[PDB]
Ligand binder design. Sequence first.
Ligand SMILES: *[C@@H]1O[C@H](CO)[C@@H](O)[C@H](O)[C@H]1NC(C)=O
Ligand SMILES: *[C@@H]1O[C@H](CO)[C@@H](O)[C@H](O)[C@H]1NC(C)=O
Ligand SMILES: *[C@@H]1O[C@H](CO)[C@@H](O)[C@H](O)[C@H]1NC(C)=O
Ligand SMILES: *[C@@H]1O[C@H](CO)[C@@H](O)[C@H](O)[C@H]1NC(C)=O
Ligand SMILES: *[C@@H]1O[C@H](CO)[C@@H](O)[C@H](O)[C@H]1NC(C)=O
Ligand SMILES: *[C@@H]1O[C@H](CO)[C@@H](O)[C@H](O)[C@H]1NC(C)=O
Ligand SMILES: [Mg+2]
Lengths: 507, 48, 281, 49, 20, 145, 49, 56
Amino acid sequence: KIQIQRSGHLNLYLLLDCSQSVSENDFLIFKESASLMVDRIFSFEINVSVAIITFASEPKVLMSVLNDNSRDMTEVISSLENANYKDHENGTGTNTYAALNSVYLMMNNQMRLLGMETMAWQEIRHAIILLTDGKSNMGGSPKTAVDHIREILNINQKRNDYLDIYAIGVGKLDVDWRELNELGSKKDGERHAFILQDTKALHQVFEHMLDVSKLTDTICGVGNMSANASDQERTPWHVTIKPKSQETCRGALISDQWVLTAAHCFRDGNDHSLWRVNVGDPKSQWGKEFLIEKAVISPGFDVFAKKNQGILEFYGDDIALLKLAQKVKMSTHARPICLPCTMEANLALRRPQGSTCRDHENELLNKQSVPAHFVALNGSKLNINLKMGVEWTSCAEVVSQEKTMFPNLTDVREVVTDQFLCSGTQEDESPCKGEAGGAVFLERRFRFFQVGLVSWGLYNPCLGSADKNSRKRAPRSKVPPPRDFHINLFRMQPWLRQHLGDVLNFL
Amino acid sequence: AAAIIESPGGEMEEAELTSWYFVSSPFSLDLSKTKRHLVPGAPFLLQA
Amino acid sequence: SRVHYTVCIWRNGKVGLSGMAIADVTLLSGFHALRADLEKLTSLSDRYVSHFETEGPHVLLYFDSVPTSRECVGFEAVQEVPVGLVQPASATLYDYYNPERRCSVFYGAPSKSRLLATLCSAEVCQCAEGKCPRQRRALERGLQDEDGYRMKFACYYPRVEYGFQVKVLREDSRAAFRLFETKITQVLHFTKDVKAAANQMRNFLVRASCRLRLEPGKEYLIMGLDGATYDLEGHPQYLLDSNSWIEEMPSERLCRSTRQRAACAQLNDFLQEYGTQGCQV
Amino acid sequence: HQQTVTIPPKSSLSVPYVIVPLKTGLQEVEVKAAVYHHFISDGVRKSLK
Amino acid sequence: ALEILQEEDLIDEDDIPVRS
Amino acid sequence: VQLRVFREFHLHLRLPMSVRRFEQLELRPVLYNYLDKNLTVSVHVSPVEGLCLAGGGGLAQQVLVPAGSARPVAFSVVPTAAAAVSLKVVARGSFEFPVGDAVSKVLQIEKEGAIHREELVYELNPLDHRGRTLEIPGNSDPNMI
Amino acid sequence: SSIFQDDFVIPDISEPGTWKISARFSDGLESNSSTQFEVKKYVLPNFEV
Amino acid sequence: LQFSLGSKINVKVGGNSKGTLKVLRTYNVLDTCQDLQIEVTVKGHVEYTMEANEDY
Ligand SMILES: *[C@@H]1O[C@H](CO)[C@@H](O)[C@H](O)[C@H]1NC(C)=O
Ligand SMILES: *[C@@H]1O[C@H](CO)[C@@H](O)[C@H](O)[C@H]1NC(C)=O
Ligand SMILES: *[C@@H]1O[C@H](CO)[C@@H](O)[C@H](O)[C@H]1NC(C)=O
Ligand SMILES: *[C@@H]1O[C@H](CO)[C@@H](O)[C@H](O)[C@H]1NC(C)=O
Ligand SMILES: *[C@@H]1O[C@H](CO)[C@@H](O)[C@H](O)[C@H]1NC(C)=O
Ligand SMILES: *[C@@H]1O[C@H](CO)[C@@H](O)[C@H](O)[C@H]1NC(C)=O
Ligand SMILES: [Mg+2]
């Protein structure tokens, strides 16, 4: 397993087969797989050094770990992009020994530099990922080179975790399972050699090929992405508010000790005692319960303020903050969620230093139909489409049809303030009753950002009490079309900053 | 001394006894509780 | 379905600890002994075994007088499940009063050897267990492939780390390994044996438990995996195990006729391409 | 018809079955369950009218 | 083969825990 | 507080303390079947580098354990490794009776040769001039590995 | 905290015998107390007789 | 005291008490039943499955 932690260095050596035994399409599969792997690894913003060595009858080095540019994602991506399949026409044999000896030469050159006795070299871990069919027909047995690799790093029983050799064969090409198993490192409780069919399965397997368990710093957005993980692992920021043994409103962790939730959950309660926030826990499946010490309600929120004018309910300024009385120990089951208009969101998007949230708004909501997700009652993740631009104008018009609740004309300027986002149109799901406050997030560069929280809607698909899982479907003839809404976080920056200026670092 | 052999496992283990004395009386007496040189004119309690 | 055993015990160390013994033998991997024969042995007037206990593959016997000369006592066993692999079993004999004075002996199946075959020479003791190869006379018989009978075998499914064309001079035997002394005419491919060249002698070892044989005088082509043992002169020694390509090279005497000359052409194309080019594909 | 189901610790799992009766009287409905590595082979039989 | 052989109808061998 | 553990069907493996390399040994794992149903299992040892198994390494032996009984399986092995190996034996049952167990243990290999101890007794009396300073000669035995 | 924990390694070639560990107050010369543990080459048994 | 050195060492003594010194050096050295004997012979036919290493 490729260990992830804040201490040390991770030298990644990606070897790609470039022989006659792999065709051009298989080489494209290998290249896109390596691109995906190098993209995912850099998402954790750790110290990583990546070296690309496409190998054939002779070993050709495309980028050097010793080179100081190995700590840049775009440079490595561009260097891998310039790989050529025809560069090895003179020699089309598979020479695994050449690649392994090139890796050994790189490692020895690094060892001579900076001094072997220095702890900086001692704390370096290695990970060699070979994408090949394994049929190495010349140059010598891989065992000699592997033993040489072990001896240079003196990989004993105690230091067995400092060298990981993988052998992943992805594509239609025939793969000898025995050879791939022999090439991969032999460890007691994990698999190091795989055979696959496409790149999505490789993404899943690579998601299993890491362990963020040793990482416990306050990083936002980072979360699992494999489909075989628990529902809480995929959305660690999901926390829940329990008034009295009931499971009413959801939330999102925005810091070590803060939670952001809708303000209409705390309608008729000022006794913060007996209120418990359920937070995911690595051990128990029901989570650990925390106590809230300060609940802040937006002063501009008043449901019945426009009652006389004809607006039965107006959900403006529907936002609240919670401060747990105890610090949440970050783990693999609970991590914050990236909020925009802050330094960490800028860092997670790999944007220039001199950025402003005016650019963040366009970067994160450029499309006229931006995909987004929110968490269901049972913990699953659903899909919606936030609509901006001219497409937003048609959205609010549908509310005017619902004159049974507000008899007035109810145009966009009156009921649907600019603070709300569309959803629920065409092939889009709608939240049930009991999902208010749940983050409406979106994924960018393998990192999750929050761009709003559920506020209200026009149809509850959980009215039928079949189960907590079954969800009704709105009939096509259902007179009010489903048209949900979510408070937009960007418009609420003036309220956010003065309440969280010290906790975070806003732009 | 005994050395039993498990079957069909094959493992063998041994035990020995070194406490089966030959005696001429199946009981014993411990008069350490009894006092000594006790007063006259009062009952003398013999404790065994 | 049944096999007859035989247990012979004696002592030549009467100076040391003496007395009785417990003969604990382990039957084969699936057999189990007959209780009737052991009962007949024990219930004799001049009984030789005084106590016994049979359970599955385990037989325990108690000999009350270990003699100085050979004294064999036999019984019978039946078979329950097939023997999944060839292996030698064990038979131990403890001393009654001091069980630490034991004697363990390995024994084999009615036709196999008592110890696992292993190629051992000085420090290296490379294993030689598995299957033994066949003498594939592909050229003599009629068959055809598109650079697949030999080039595929050398570059696609198995990876041959060495390949030579050699002449068989002398045949010999060494323990359980049949030895062939050969001389290298031309080197086709090598990885570790760099010192190999023309007019250099090499040794080929094959287990003497099967029918493979290399006739003297003939010229052969040898290809397979590189070994780990060395000869008495300090040169590498190769074991003719499975997944190894051995084929006698025709002398053109039985090839001049039209039918086999095409196969000979495919041969020469192979050897030339493999010798000149480094295992393409 | 056989289904392999994993039961979470300190929990329970419901396996639904569909039966349509085309005969009258009392008939037996039996389900056989065998646990893995726990030797438990408990199966329950009931009578449906 | 004196008796029957139940080959490849056995447990997966991956679900059997290893005690070390 | 006595606290006993049990499996009702398990593999027991007892390796010796150490074994000289290249010297043939026999492993005797025993299957214990304390269940109430007569069984049948297949036992094989996972091949690993440094061990010269019999048959190649991947072969398995069919062995049946009656109710409330035990059965041993013999595996001849000559360890040709250098320092140590980790050998694992797996027993897998049928789908009718879904039982099995796997045991992995480290087999240590001792260094070539034997242990030799040399003692040098030395009197000492600082009440005399001669004993005030003294010298210890080295060992020139050419049998040291 | 009135507790002292420590580890030490027996030499590999140690002959069988009984080792003794003592502990006394620094000020009090005769305030010692001892425990014993046997050193012996063994393999843990499977059953007791 | 356990220690590891080469092949020459000197001893410097103080004090005024008789005693006995011992230097013990342990190192590796170069390397059929003796008294009790046993032999087992097997005769019969044994049936194998997927074991016979003879092809064709
Ligand atoms: C990563 O590397 C940088 C640059 O050498 C160093 O300052 C930093 O401490 C390292 N660790 C982390 C966790 O960023
Ligand atoms: C996910 O789990 C399923 C069984 O639920 C398994 O078949 C599949 O291989 C697993 N996927 C990965 C990528 O490990
Ligand atoms: C994702 O989840 C899997 C399954 O729980 C876990 O083993 C793996 O380490 C995780 N990968 C990450 C967090 O990158
Ligand atoms: C969770 O509930 C949703 C509601 O739409 C349903 O589609 C999904 O199958 C459920 N997931 C589970 C039960 O894992
Ligand atoms: C198991 O084996 C015994 C003989 O050892 C046989 O008689 C019996 O029928 C088998 N089945 C059981 C005990 O259920
Ligand atoms: C303490 O040490 C003395 C010798 O100084 C010894 O005789 C005595 O038994 C020791 N007391 C113990 C071990 O309790
Ligand atoms: Mg190839």
